[PDB]
């Protein structure tokens, strides 16, 4: 009647990968919580794009999802720019 | 490709299994999702660096990630 519950602590991206991506973005220092933040937001991103892609392959009838479908779905996202135009 | 492939593929397939799509993903498609995830996250961290600098902070905090996220209007 005494149970320890299962938990997924990688959540798709490792710690060295997170730190490396943060350095490639110019971040020289982070709080450890960043890890659980990144693992969270990454999911959301995939959660969006996968949906955006699958409905694509759902509207044009197919049993599989091409990389072109996820490029389309990626362009179906918003494009943030550092300036005006 | 900075993200190790095995945990990432695992996560992607789990997300697909929540949507109950039961549609196999092209290997190159999951690869594209990985590359896009890398580019996304790196841009995020640039925005968080800017946010922390404007906050008089060297250390970036989850708040900086959330603000960098809402400034782009995502969930």
């Amino acid at each position: 009647r005494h149970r320890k519950v299962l938990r997924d602590n990688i959540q798709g991206i490792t710690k060295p990968a997170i730190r490396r991506l943060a350095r490639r973005g110019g971040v020289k220092r982070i709080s450890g919580l960043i890890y659980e933040e990144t693992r969270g937001v990454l999911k959301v991103f995939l959660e969006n794009v996968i949906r955006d892609a699958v409905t694509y392959t759902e509207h044009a009838k197919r049993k599989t999802v091409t990389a072109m479908d996820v490029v389309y779905a990626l362009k179906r996202q918003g494009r943030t720019l550092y300036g005006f135009g | 490709l900075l993200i190790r492939k095995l945990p990432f593929q695992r996560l992607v397939r789990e997300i697909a299994q929540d949507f109950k799509t039961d549609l196999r993903f092209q290997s190159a498609a999951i690869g594209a999702l990985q590359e896009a995830s890398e580019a996304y996250l790196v841009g995020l961290f640039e925005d968080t660096n800017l946010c922390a600098i404007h906050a008089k902070r060297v250390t970036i905090m989850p708040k900086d990630i959330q603000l960098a996220r809402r400034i782009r209007g995502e969930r």
């Binding site: 005494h2 519950v5 220092r29 | -």
Partner: peptide, 19 residues
């Protein structure tokens, strides 16, 4: 706490309590 990022093993799953 804070982690200095300038070039400074994590299994897949772990288990804790709460049943």
């Amino acid at each position: 706490e804070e982690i200095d990022l300038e070039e400074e093993d994590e299994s897949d799953y772990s288990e804790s309590d709460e049943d």
